[PDB]
Design a protein around this ligand. Structure first.
Ligand SMILES: [Zn+2]
Ligand SMILES: [Zn+2]
Ligand SMILES: [Zn+2]
Ligand SMILES: [Zn+2]
Ligand SMILES: [Zn+2]
Lengths: 154, 379, 303, 379, 303
DNA sequence: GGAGGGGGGTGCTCTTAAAGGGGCAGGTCGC
DNA sequence: GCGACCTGCCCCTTTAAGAGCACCCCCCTCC
C-alpha cells in the first residue's frame, strides 16, 4: 500500500520544504500554513500556548510524572522513548559522533557543540536568533532555540 | 588546457552535440557494475599460493604489497624494491584535457597510497573509439595526451611509451612504476587500536559527474529538479572535476612526516569496500569504523532521490581519483589536517577525520546513521 | 678503525660458500623470495642479498658460523662479527639495521638465544678477560646515537645501565618517567655553570628510613662536553622532545615503542605503547656484553 | 585444462554456440584500422621535447629505448636501467587457456626485443565483456588467468598484481618490467651495411585466425572453399595457435651470443610496419630490404583472394605475438638459425633469413616480387 | 706501486663539491638525465651516478680537476686518477668501463686531447722521470687482459709496442695477419720444443737488388710462463680464435672493431670492419704514457 | 468490489536548552 | 610558611523537551 515515491513542494512563500510523496503535501499545508489556532495548557501555571492538537498530548506528559521507559541495564526510568534510547548508549559504550578535525568522539550533538567552541567556527556561521544573537549555522536550530529559549507564549 | 575556464567544442570547430562522455555507457554502478565479481577477479589476478614457502621459516615480507594494490617486488641487486601499479578510467568528463589529467592522477594515486612521493617512469594506454569521427579523433587525442603529460610533469616524472588500441569505448590508463629503497615506502599493516582515519578528498564525485549527464536529458532531470537546481549541479561538476585532478604527493609526504600506519586509495568499489579490503591486511586484530562521510555540496540529497542507483550513505558509491584513507594516531591526525589545510609549500586542501580503529576481526563498517559533513563548494 | 668490515665480509663469504655447497649437493628445489624465478643461493656478496634472504642467512650464522681454524665463535666475537657486517652494509649504500628493523626480528631473537648464557671467562691468567666489543665500537656502527628511534632508545638504555647501575631487566622495568627528575643544580660559585644531570632514586633494601646521604641513594648522569653527540643529557632531552606529551608526567613506563614509519622532520618518533619484556631483555642482554658496561658494573658491585 | 589439446565448450556446461571471439569485432586490417594515425598518436605520446636537452652535452642513449618500443629509463641507484613493455590484444583464439598464454607471450615480445632474457614482475589487465552472461564468466575468465600465469611461470616470473575493468570486448593485457644492468640489454641502433635479417616465427597468423572464424558462417566461406580446403584451415589454425604461444626467450638468449646489432617484434603492424620503425632508429645510414616472407602454410593463397582485408604479400598484415626480427652479420646468422633449430635442451624451432641490409636512407621496403616460403606445418 | 681507489674517489668528491657549488651559484635550470625530474647534481659518491652524468662529469674533470691544492695535475697523473676511478667502479658493483665502452666515447676523446701534446717533465739530471702509471697498475685494473674485446685489443697493441717496438700509429697500420707468422722455433732445451713466437717485419731497410741483411731482423715475443694470463702468445691465439674467419689471411688490417654485443660464450667477438685511424691514435696515446713502455722505447733510441 | 481521498493519532530522527557533577581556582582560619 | 576547609565559577556531559516527516489505522467514498 506504499504509494510510489515521487517528490513535491509547497509553493507557500518562505516555505521551501519538500515532501517524499504527493500525499503529504496537503497534510503539511494544513498543519503548517492553514491550521492556525491557539491552545492553552490545562495546567494552571504552565501557560504555554500551542497551536496543534497533537502538541498538547505530548505537553501533558511534561507536567505529569508518569514515567514508563525502563532501561534494560540500570533499570532507570525516563519520560520518553528516545530519551531512553539515547541513555542506552552509556551502558553499550558507543560514541558515534566524532569531530572531524581532532577526532574527539562523544554521544550527542550537545557535546559536539561544546567542542566546536575550541575549533573556532562561529565566524563561518551565518544564522543568528534575533533576540539574543545566538549565532547559529542552520535554520531548524533557530526554531529549536526559539522554542527552548525565547519562548513565544501568553 | 588548464588555464581555460571550460571546453567549448566550437572553439575547436567540432559539432556542438559532441560530448566526450557520449562514448562511454555510464551506469550508476559505473565501471564496477558488479563489485563482488570484479573483486574476485582482481583477487584471482593477484592470487599466488607458492609465495608462502613455509613462511620462509620466518616473517618474510609479502610480495603482493597491500595484497590488493601496489605490489612490492624485491629485486636481485641493490636490495631495492619494485613498486608499480595500473588503473584504467573511462571518460566521465566533457573536458579531454582535464580527463587525461584525471586519468594520470588516478594511475599515480596507488603509489601515493604507500608514501611514494616520486615516480621513476610511467607508461600510457590510449583507447580510440570506433564510433568516433576521424575528424574528431584528431582534435581530442592531442588534448588527452597533453593532459596526461602535464599531470605526469606535475608529479615529477615523464610519460615515455605506451600502447594505442581501438576499443568501442575510449580507454585511458597507465602504469606508474618506481624502484625505491625500503626506507621510501610504507607497508600498510601497522594499524593499532585508538587510531583515526583521515580522508584527503571529499566523496560523491561519481554522483556529481553522472548528474551532469542528466542536465541535458529532460526525462532524468525532472526526477531531481526539486532536490538540486542546475547552478549548484554545475558547481558540483566543476569541483568534482577539479578535485579528481589533484595529486596526493603532499598527502604521501605528510604521511611519512606524521607516522601514518596504513593508507589506501578510494578508487572504485566504495569507501567501505576499500576499508574492508584494507582491514584484511592488518597483522593486528583491528576493525575500522567510519563515523563521518564528507560529500560535495548538494549530493546526498540526489543520492536519496535517485534510489539505489548511487548509494552514497552506505559507502558503496564507486569513486574515481579518490583521496587516500590514512590511519594515524589521534594527535598526528589533529596536526595532519591542519598542515595539509595550510601548507606553506603549495595550495590549500582540506582533510577530514572520518572514523576510528576499534578492535575487531579485520572488518570495517559504517554506523547506522552516519553524518554528512557538507563540503562547501570552495567558498 | 677499531671496527673492521672486511672481517665480517670474509666470515659471510665463507659461510655462504659452505651453505651453497650444502644446497647444491642436496639438489632439492627451492626458490628465492625475489620476484624473478631464481634458485635460492646465498649471494657470496652481502650487498646484493635481498631483505628476506639476509634474515634467513644471518640467523643460521649464529648456529653455523665457523672460524678459519674451525672453532665455533664465542658469543662476544660473534656479536662483534655481526657489528662488522652491519658496518659493511652501511658502507655500501644499504640502509637496513640488522638489529632494529622489524624485518630482522627473528635474527635478534636467535642472537638473544645465543647471548643469554654468557658469563665472564677467567681462563686467561688475567683475572678479567676483556671483551672484544667496546663503547666506541658501537658508536662507530651507529648503534648508539640520535640516528633513528630504535638506536636512540638503545642509547638511553645504555646510559642508564652504565650510570644508574641498572643491570637486571626488572630494574629497568621499574624505571618510570616521573621518577627520573632533572634539576639545574647550578653552582653560584661557578658563574654561568649551567650544570644539568638526571637523578634517580635507588631501590636499596635497608631497614633504616630517611635520606642518609643524598649522593649515596641517588645516581646522576654527568654532561659530557667532549662530544655533545655522546652526552647522555643531550640524548635524554632529545628523547622527550620527540615523544608525545601524553606520556610525559606518567609514572608507569619510560621506554616507548618506536613508530614503524618516521621522517627526519617528524615531530614524534615514539608511540605511547611501552616495549614488551622480550624486546627489553633482548636490548639489555646485548648492552650487557660491551666491555665498558661490563667493567662499570664490575666496579659497582664489588664496592 | 592445460594438458587438454583443444577446447570443448559443452564439457564446461556451456552451449556449443559459445565462441570466445564473438566478443570482438574481428576486422581484416586488425585491431586498429589506421596505422599512420595510430602510429602518429603513439609517437605523440612518446614525444617529449625536454627529453633531448642537447644530449646533456654528452653521449646519452635514448630514454625511449628502441624509440618505438620497450623504453629504457635510467635509474638513480647503481647505474641501473628500467626496461618495461606493454601490449593489449583481444581474443583471437577460441581456446580460453591458450588465449591467456598468447596474451602473456605478446606482452614479452617487446621485452625480448631489447635483449632482456629475464623479467622481474608482470601485471595484467582483464576486461570482462558486459555482454558476457554471468555463468559463462565463472568458467571462462579463470582459464585466461590460468594460462596467463602459466606463461609467466614459464617465462621466469610471477604475475603479482593486475586490474579488472568492464569493457564491451574482452581486453587482455599486461606490463612486463625488468631492472637490468647496462650489460644485459641490446639497444637496436648498431645496424651496419652488410648484415642480414632473421625472423624467428612464420608470418601471417591473422590470416589463419580470420579464416577459421569465417569457417562457420557460409556467407563468406563459400568463396574461400575453391582456393583452400576446409581441413587446411584447421591445421593452419593449430599451427598459428601453437606458434603464438611459444615465447621468444630462447631467441633473446642467443642475440647476446651472436652479436645482434638490432632486433624488434613483429606485433600488430606487420613485417613491413615494424621494419620501417626498426630502420628509423639506426644511427648509421642503412636501409632494409625484405627478399622473403615465410608465410604460414597455404595461408598465402587465401591472402590473395581478399588482398584488401589481409594484404600479406605487401607486408602490412597485422600479427599477434610474432617472432623477433634481428639484424645479424651473415657469418653469425648462419649459426643463429642452426643453433635455434636444434637446441641442446630441446624444443627447437626454425628461423629464416628473410632479407639483407644495405646502405640507404633509414627506410625499409619489400621488393616488388618477394618469394613466399610455405612453412610446412608441424604434425 | 698499486692502485688506491679511495684517492680516486677523493678526487671525484672534491670536483663534485666544487661543481655542485657552481651549479647552485649559477641558479640555472638543468635536469638530470634520469627518469625522475631531479635537478642535475653530481653525486658526491661515484656509484649512484648515471652513465650520462658519469660521462659528462669525467669530461669536465680533465679541465676542471685542479686536484693539487691550487695546482692542476700533469697529463700523466690524470691517467692514474681515472684508472683509480675505474678500479673503484669495478670494486663497488658498477659495470662501466670508462675507457672502451661505447657510451663513454666522448670522454676518451678529451683525454686524448689533453695527452697528445705530451711535454716531458725534465730535470737538470735528465728526463729519467718514470711516469706514475705502470704495467702492474693497468693489469690490476681490467684494462689489459682477455676480459672484454676492447681490453684484448688494447693488450695486443700494448704487447706490439712493447716488443715489436711500434712507436707511431703509421707503423701500427702497416701490420696485418699475414705479415705476422707463428714460428715453432727449436728451444735451447731439446726435450721441450713447445714454445713458439710471433715475428713482424722490422728494420727491413732497403730490399734493392736483393740487399742482404741478417736473416733475423725482426723482434720476437717469447713465452712468459710465470702467468698464463700475461703470455704474449696465448693472447694472440685467443684473439685469432675470436676474430671472424674471413678476416684471417688478409693483408689489409690487423686490429678489428669489437662487436657492441658480446656474451661470455660468444664464439666471435670482433667484426671485419677494421679499427679507425683515430681509434688507433687514441689507444696508442693511452698505451704510450705507461712508464714501462717509455723504458722499452727509451732503450731502443739508446741502442 | 474497489483504489483513492479525508481525518485522526504516533514513532523516530534531529535539534536545542537546562540541570548537574567534577574539577580548578579564590579567601579564611589553624598550625 | 604551609596546609585544611568553604565556597565560587567554568567545563563538559546527560536529561528534558519541541519540530517535523513518514507512517499506520480507520473510515468514507462515488465510479
Ligand atoms: Zn508549505
Ligand atoms: Zn503545560
Ligand atoms: Zn540505563
Ligand atoms: Zn575538534
Ligand atoms: Zn537567543
Amino acid at each position: 500500500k506504499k504509494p510510489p515515491i515521487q517528490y513535491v513542494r509547497c509553493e507557500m512563500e518562505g516555505c521551501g520544504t519538500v515532501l517524499a510523496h504527493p500525499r503529504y503535501l496537503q497534510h503539511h499545508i494544513k498543519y503548517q500554513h492553514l491550521l492556525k489556532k491557539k491552545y492553552v495548557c490545562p495546567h494552571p501555571s504552565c501557560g504555554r500556548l500551542f497551536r496543534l492538537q497533537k502538541q498538547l498530548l505530548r505537553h501533558a506528559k511534561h507536567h505529569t510524572d508518569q514515567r514508563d521507559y525502563i532501561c534494560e541495564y540500570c533499570a532507570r526510568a525516563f519520560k520518553s522513548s528516545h530519551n531512553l534510547a539515547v541513555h542506552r548508549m552509556i551502558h553499550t559504550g558507543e560514541k558515534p559522533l566524532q569531530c572531524e578535525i581532532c577526532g574527539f568522539t562523544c554521544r550527542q550533538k550537545a557535546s559536539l557543540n561544546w567542542h566546536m567552541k575550541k575549533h573556532d567556527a562561529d565566524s563561518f556561521y551565518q544564522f543568528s536568533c534575533n533576540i539574543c544573537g545566538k549565532k547559529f549555522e542552520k535554520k531548524d536550530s533557530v526554531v529549536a532555540h526559539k522554542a527552548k529559549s525565547h519562548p513565544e507564549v501568553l | 588546457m588548464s588555464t581555460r575556464e571550460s571546453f567549448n567544442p566550437e572553439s575547436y570547430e567540432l559539432d556542438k552535440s559532441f560530448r566526450l562522455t557520449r562514448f562511454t555507457e555510464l551506469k550508476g554502478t559505473g565501471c564496477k557494475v558488479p563489485q563482488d565479481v570484479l573483486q574476485k577477479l582482481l583477487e584471482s589476478l593477484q592470487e599466488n599460493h607458492f609465495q608462502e614457502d613455509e613462511q620462509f621459516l620466518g616473517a618474510v615480507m609479502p610480495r603482493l604489497g597491500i595484497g590488493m594494490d601496489t605490489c612490492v617486488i624485491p629485486l636481485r641487486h641493490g636490495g631495492l624494491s619494485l613498486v608499480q601499479t595500473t588503473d584504467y578510467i573511462y571518460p566521465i568528463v566533457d573536458d579531454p584535457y582535464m580527463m587525461g589529467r584525471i586519468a594520470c592522477a588516478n594511475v599515480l594515486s596507488d603509489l601515493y597510497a604507500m608514501g611514494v612521493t616520486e615516480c621513476d617512469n610511467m607508461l600510457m594506454l590510449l583507447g580510440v573509439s570506433n564510433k568516433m569521427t576521424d575528424r574528431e579523433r584528431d582534435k581530442v587525442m592531442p588534448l588527452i595526451i597533453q593532459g596526461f603529460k602535464d599531470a605526469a610533469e606535475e608529479a615529477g616524472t615523464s610519460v615515455t611509451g605506451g600502447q594505442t588500441v581501438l576499443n568501442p569505448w575510449i580507454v585511458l590508463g597507465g602504469v606508474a612504476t618506481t624502484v625505491c629503497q625500503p626506507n621510501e615506502f610504507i607497508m600498510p599493516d601497522n594499524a593499532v587500536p585508538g587510531d583515526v582515519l583521515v580522508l584527503t578528498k571529499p566523496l560523491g564525485t561519481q554522483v556529481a559527474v553522472a548528474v551532469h549527464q542528466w542536465l541535458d536529458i529532460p526525462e532524468k532531470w525532472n526526477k531531481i529538479k526539486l532536490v538540486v537546481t542546475q547552478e549548484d549541479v554545475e558547481l558540483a561538476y566543476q569541483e568534482a572535476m577539479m578535485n579528481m585532478a589533484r595529486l596526493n604527493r603532499t598527502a604521501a609526504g605528510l604521511m611519512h612526516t606524521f607516522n601514518a600506519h596504513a593508507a589506501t586509495d578510494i578508487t572504485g568499489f566504495g569507501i567501505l569496500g576499500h576499508a574492508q579490503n584494507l582491514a584484511k591486511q592488518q597483522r593486528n586484530e583491528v576493525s575500522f569504523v567510519i563515523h563521518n562521510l564528507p560529500v560535495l555540496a548538494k549530493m546526498a540529497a540526489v543520492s536519496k532521490a535517485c534510489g539505489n542507483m548511487f548509494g552514497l550513505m552506505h559507502g558503496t558509491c564507486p569513486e574515481t581519483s579518490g583521496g587516500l584513507l590514512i590511519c594515524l594516531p589521534r594527535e598526528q591526525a589533529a596536526r595532519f589536517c591542519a598542515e595539509i589545510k595550510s601548507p606553506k609549500y603549495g595550495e590549500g586542501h582540506q582533510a577530514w577525520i572520518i572514523g576510528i580503529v576499534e578492535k575487531g576481526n579485520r572488518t570495517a563498517r559504517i554506523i547506522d546513521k552516519p553524518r554528512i559533513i557538507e563540503v562547501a563548494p570552495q567558498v | 678503525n677499531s671496527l673492521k668490515p672486511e672481517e665480517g665480509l670474509e666470515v659471510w663469504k665463507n659461510w655462504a660458500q659452505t651453505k651453497n655447497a650444502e644446497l647444491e649437493k642436496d639438489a632439492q628445489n627451492r626458490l628465492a623470495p625475489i620476484g624473478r624465478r631464481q634458485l635460492l643461493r646465498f649471494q657470496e656478496d652481502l650487498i646484493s642479498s635481498a631483505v628476506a634472504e639476509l634474515n634467513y642467512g644471518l640467523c643460521l650464522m649464529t648456529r653455523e658460523a665457523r672460524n678459519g681454524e674451525g672453532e665455533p665463535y664465542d658469543p662476544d666475537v660473534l656479536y662483534y662479527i655481526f657489528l662488522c657486517i652491519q658496518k659493511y652494509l652501511f658502507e655500501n649504500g644499504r640502509v637496513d639495521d640488522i638489529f632494529s628493523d622489524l624485518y630482522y626480528v627473528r635474527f635478534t631473537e636467535w642472537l638473544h638465544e645465543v647471548l643469554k648464557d654468557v658469563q665472564p671467562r677467567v681462563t686467561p691468567l688475567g683475572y678479567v678477560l676483556p671483551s672484544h666489543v667496546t663503547e666506541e665500537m658501537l658508536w662507530e656502527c651507529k648503534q648508539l646515537g640520535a640516528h633513528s628511534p630504535s638506536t636512540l632508545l638503545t642509547t638511553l638504555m645504555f646510559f642508564n645501565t652504565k650510570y644508574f647501575l641498572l643491570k637486571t631487566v626488572d630494574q629497568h622495568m621499574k624505571l618510570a618517567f616521573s621518577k627520573v627528575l632533572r634539576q639545574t643544580k647550578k653552582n653560584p660559585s661557578n658563574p654561568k655553570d649551567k650544570s644539568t644531570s638526571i637523578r634517580y632514586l635507588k631501590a636499596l633494601g635497608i631497614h633504616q628510613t630517611g635520606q642518609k646521604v643524598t649522593d649515596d641513594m641517588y645516581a646522576e648522569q654527568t654532561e659530557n662536553p667532549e662530544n655533545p653527540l655522546r652526552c647522555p643529557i643531550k640524548l635524554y632531552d632529545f628523547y622527550l622532545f620527540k615523544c608525545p606529551q601524553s606520556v610525559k608526567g606518567r609514572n608507569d613506563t619510560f621506554y616507548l615503542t618506536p613508530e614503524p614509519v618516521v621522517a627526519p622532520n617528524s615531530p614524534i618518533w615514539y608511540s605511547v605503547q611501552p616495549i614488551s619484556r622480550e624486546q627489553m631483555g633482548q636490548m639489555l642482554t646485548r648492552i650487557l656484553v660491551i666491555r665498558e658496561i661490563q667493567e662499570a658494573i664490575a666496579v659497582a658491585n664489588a664496592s
